[PDB]
Amino acid sequence: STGVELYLDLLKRTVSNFIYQDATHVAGLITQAAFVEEARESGEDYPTVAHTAIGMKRLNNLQHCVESALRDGVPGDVLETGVWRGGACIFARGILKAYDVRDRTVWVADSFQGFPKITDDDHPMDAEMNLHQYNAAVDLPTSLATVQRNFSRYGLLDDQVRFLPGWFKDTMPTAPFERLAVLRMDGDSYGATMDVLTHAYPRLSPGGFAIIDDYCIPACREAVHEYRDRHGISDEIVEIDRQGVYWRRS
Amino acid sequence: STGVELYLDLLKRTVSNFIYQDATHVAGLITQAAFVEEARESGEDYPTVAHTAIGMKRLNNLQHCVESALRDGVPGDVLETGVWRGGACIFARGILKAYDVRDRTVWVADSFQGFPKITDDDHPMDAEMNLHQYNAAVDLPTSLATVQRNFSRYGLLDDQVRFLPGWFKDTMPTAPFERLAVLRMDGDSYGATMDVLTHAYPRLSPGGFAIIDDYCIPACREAVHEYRDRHGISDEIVEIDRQGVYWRRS
Ligand SMILES: CC[C@H]1OC(=O)/C=C/[C@H](C)[C@@H](O[C@@H]2O[C@H](C)C[C@H](N(C)C)[C@H]2O)[C@@H](C)C[C@@H](C)C(=O)/C=C/C=C/[C@@H]1CO[C@@H]1O[C@H](C)[C@@H](O)[C@@H](O)[C@H]1O
Ligand SMILES: CC[C@H]1OC(=O)/C=C/[C@H](C)[C@@H](O[C@@H]2O[C@H](C)C[C@H](N(C)C)[C@H]2O)[C@@H](C)C[C@@H](C)C(=O)/C=C/C=C/[C@@H]1CO[C@@H]1O[C@H](C)[C@@H](O)[C@@H](O)[C@H]1O
Ligand SMILES: Nc1ncnc2c1ncn2[C@@H]1O[C@H](CSCC[C@H](N)C(=O)O)[C@@H](O)[C@H]1O
Ligand SMILES: Nc1ncnc2c1ncn2[C@@H]1O[C@H](CSCC[C@H](N)C(=O)O)[C@@H](O)[C@H]1O
Ligand SMILES: [Mg+2]
Ligand SMILES: [Mg+2]
């Protein structure tokens, strides 16, 4: 175990709070508050304190994607769309820091207000799901200032972390990045997924990775397949855990 | 910058819980529960959750002592007497892990049940202080099993961590280590300090470090000076923060 391996291993345990094992909110299928190791390992609970909810398997996937991009010389930045308390983005910045990468940026995109209120412009599956109803229940609204504060606690708030506050339909089309090596999508809805695929995926480098955190949600999956069909994308969809999948852009 | 530096920096922030900033118990001179950065930085509060109470300055000192011993080839193990939830010993094991040191052990010595009830054999200053009164108030009693669990959460429970459960007057004289490079004393009382100086200090290598966590406590200081006078020890006492001091054995 090298210094780098030890740091990144600890960083994953810390952002997911395997260290102190905070209770989960009781919501959805989670019926008790107790920390359950298997649930945190696969990112299935709603941490009361942890900086990410994606779990160890999806953190490991993020590491694999970033390391592979670095190893293979895939150009570009890392973007996460849907960051909550920022833990996955903190981890991404940590990976770059561990390898002393100074020429890539972690872009942190969120409304910083939780899920949007549904209107008649929403896809019917998003309207039915109405994720907005869960904002308070899982402490989803997390301000930009809080996310910045969280980065600073790890010593990782610096000029290689850039923030894109706003709804993805507004921020993605003109987001100032030129190229992405990893595009990590974690907005849950058809709308958020389609917004980001439409406006950010064209900037994903060949050899880069597209991660769909919420593929288990029918609305999200619907967007993925509609987008891939439209663009003739046949790159293998690889399952990570019970929620997430990814593909590598050929 | 380097992987090692990043890992050890993160490990300090984690064991002291600068990451999630848990409340303090309201006790002693601490009059409110809120996390205060300055108090955790100098190890002056009573963390509700964090694995160590010693704070960042004393964690930095422990790192300095261990790194200096390794750098200078000072032979021996690391012993902490008075470990609470184990965070300072977890950090010590992490330092050895970071440098891939396989030939030194971290010894973890505690009653694993908090301060002892005062008896007629106790030093009058210890009787007056009666540290036993605080056990439950600051959650001091922490079992061996809990401490082992805590090490495991960092991936640092292995055969280079050895436990010495019991009162120091019982465990120290025949503790199986031969040599120490760092002796970290954090038992607060005249009795605990004198027990450990008497029975462990003779095994501290020349060039090794003796850390007195609780030098601000009159009873502890009394023991330190009595011991040093008895043995003709004049090695400079160097202040770390508002509580701790150390010297290097010449
Ligand atoms: C609490 C927040 C959460 O809400 C739930 O989990 C709600 C679960 C419903 C209650 C389920 O319905 C029940 O199924 C029973 C089996 C039979 C029930 N009935 C018929 C008796 C029926 O009522 C769902 C199956 C409904 C479908 C539409 C669905 O998938 C909805 C997804 C909702 C996801 C939100 C956001 O969480 C995101 O999750 C991502 C995965 C994470 O990565 C992360 O990003 C996170 O932020
Ligand atoms: C809560 C637990 C704690 O209790 C206290 O802190 C009690 C503080 C008293 C209230 C103080 O009195 C006040 O002084 C004011 C200056 C004027 C006040 N008054 C007359 C106006 C007077 O009332 C003390 C100074 C009294 C002296 C005998 C002393 O030092 C006692 C030490 C007690 C330490 C325990 C164990 O905590 C350990 O501390 C280590 C240092 C840590 O590293 C760590 O190991 C930890 O576990
Ligand atoms: N259309 C939209 N535009 C911008 N942000 C959105 C959005 N829909 C959802 N979000 C945001 O998407 C996030 C979903 S949760 C993200 C989890 C996070 N990746 C983690 O590591 O735990 C929330 O922060 C929410 O505010
Ligand atoms: N005589 C004695 N023998 C063994 N353990 C003792 C003792 N007197 C006090 N202790 C133990 O000394 C510890 C004091 S607190 C130690 C704090 C710890 N170093 C940290 O990193 O935060 C407690 O765990 C208590 O159980
Ligand atoms: Mg998700
Ligand atoms: Mg102390």
UniProtKB/Swiss-Prot annotation, chains A, B:
GO MF term set: magnesium ion binding; O-methyltransferase activity; small molecule binding
Keyword field: Antibiotic biosynthesis, Magnesium, Metal-binding, Methyltransferase, S-adenosyl-L-methionine, Transferase
Pfam families documented for this protein: TylF (PF05711)
Loss of function: phenotype: No production of mycinamicin II and accumulation of mycinamicin III.
Co-factor(s): Mg(2+)
Presence of the UniProt keyword Methyltransferase in the record: yes
UniProt catalytic activity: mycinamicin III + S-adenosyl-L-methionine = mycinamicin IV + S-adenosyl-L-homocysteine + H(+)
Biological or metabolic pathway of the protein: Antibiotic biosynthesis; mycinamicin biosynthesis
InterPro entries assigned: SAM-dependent_MTases_sf (IPR029063), TylF_MeTrfase (IPR008884)
Binding positions (Mg(2+)): 186, 213-214
Similarity-based family: Belongs to the methyltransferase TylF/MycF family.
Protein name in the entry: Mycinamicin III 3''-O-methyltransferase
Species of origin: Micromonospora griseorubida
Origin organism lineage: Bacteria, Bacillati, Actinomycetota, Actinomycetes, Micromonosporales
